[PDB]
């Protein structure tokens, strides 16, 4: 009865939003390290 409201979606969307951050940041982080 509580899965119909979509409360599971918020946690479901939280994992991917957190997962797709570290690789985005470290890619940005190491890009600065290669120097122009």
């Amino acid at each position: 009865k509580a899965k119909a409201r979509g409360d599971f979606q918020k946690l479901r969307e939280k994992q991917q939003l957190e997962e797709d951050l570290k690789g985005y940041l470290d890619w940005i982080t190491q890009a600065e390290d290669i120097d122009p």
Partner: protein
């Protein structure tokens, strides 16, 4: 008796001839029509049904009527492919196929006054969009790179360098880098009839930004003929269109942020000061993908530069094995 067999077999061993001879300026077929139905093309030219996409190259300057093609693939099958002027001519003859089409009032016109089509509905017109059906271009269509951002902005300055990064040490010999910054947003195939050549007649064109933004392909020929693509970053390479039909047909790789939620979540990487671009940064996605983008064949899309490495590298390597 076969007088052609002495010539066409000589022509057949003349088309590719020495094979190892480098193919010349490309001639890209764009109109689809049956090449097997009617037997033609000097050498009997049994080429497959013509179409767009296939990026062919001409080097056999035998006759203007039909040319030679080099489709991007290992071997580059050689067939007598119609000329840019002649391809629109082979499509011409089918205009009256369906009951004498055109100006004629064909409705129950069997009797007394008849109506054949005059020489007015054919290619005698349509000058505004008068474009050569074939696209002459050069070596290994360079691949263009577009992601949702403003080029020259925080996230780009670091990351936009890292898109090739490995490619500098990984993909060379086959590929090279020629970093240029210009405004390729004025001409696509043919718009201006008085292009850059004089700044002495007080023309408004010379007063505007022409010349350097015009002859990008002309100077890049020295590297385009070197069988190596172009890697560039400027202030105009930001979205589809314009470049989608510019002087170089694009292969687009998408450095996308995937979810718009992480677009704004990443947009503050080092604290704040997005003040150069905040709004235009969120619609930086919206100006390219909300409407059907119909592009970005190679979506460099993952939370990994290493997996985006394989996503980018796999396509180019196979696409470059073709010119071997």
């Amino acid at each position: 008796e076969s007088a052609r067999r002495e010539v066409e077999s000589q022509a057949q061993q003349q088309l590719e001839r020495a094979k190892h001879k480098p193919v010349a300026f490309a001639v890209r077929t764009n109109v689809s029509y049956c090449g097997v139905l009617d037997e033609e093309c000097p050498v009997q030219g049994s080429g497959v049904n013509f179409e767009a996409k296939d990026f062919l190259h001409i080097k056999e300057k035998y006759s203007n009527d039909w040319w030679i093609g080099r489709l991007v693939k290992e071997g580059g099958d050689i067939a007598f492919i119609p000329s840019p002027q002649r391809l629109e001519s082979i499509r011409l003859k089918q205009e009256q196929k369906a009951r004498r089409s055109g100006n004629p009032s064909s409705l129950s016109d069997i009797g007394n006054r008849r109506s054949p089509p005059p020489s007015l509905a054919k290619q005698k017109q349509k000058q505004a969009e008068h474009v050569p059906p074939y696209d002459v271009v050069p070596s290994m269509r360079p691949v263009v790179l577009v992601g949702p951002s403003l080029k020259g902005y925080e996230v780009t300055d670091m990351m936009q360098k890292a898109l090739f990064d490995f490619l500098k040490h990984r993909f060379d010999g086959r590929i090279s880098i020629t970093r240029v910054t210009a405004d390729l947003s004025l001409a696509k195939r043919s718009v201006l009839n008085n292009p850059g050549k004089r700044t002495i007649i007080e023309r408004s064109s010379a007063r505007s930004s022409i010349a350097e933004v015009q002859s990008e392909i002309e100077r890049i020929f020295e590297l385009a003929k070197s069988l190596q693509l172009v890697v560039l970053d400027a202030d105009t390479i930001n979205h589809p269109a314009q470049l989608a039909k510019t002087s170089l047909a694009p292969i687009i790789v998408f450095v996308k942020v995937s979810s718009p939620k992480v677009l704004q979540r990443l947009i503050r990487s080092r604290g704040k000061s997005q003040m150069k671009h905040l709004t235009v940064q969120m619609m930086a996605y919206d100006k390219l993908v909300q409407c059907p983008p119909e592009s970005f064949d190679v979506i460099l899309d993952e939370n990994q530069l290493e997996d985006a490495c394989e996503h980018l590298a796999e396509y180019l390597e196979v696409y470059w094995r073709a010119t071997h």
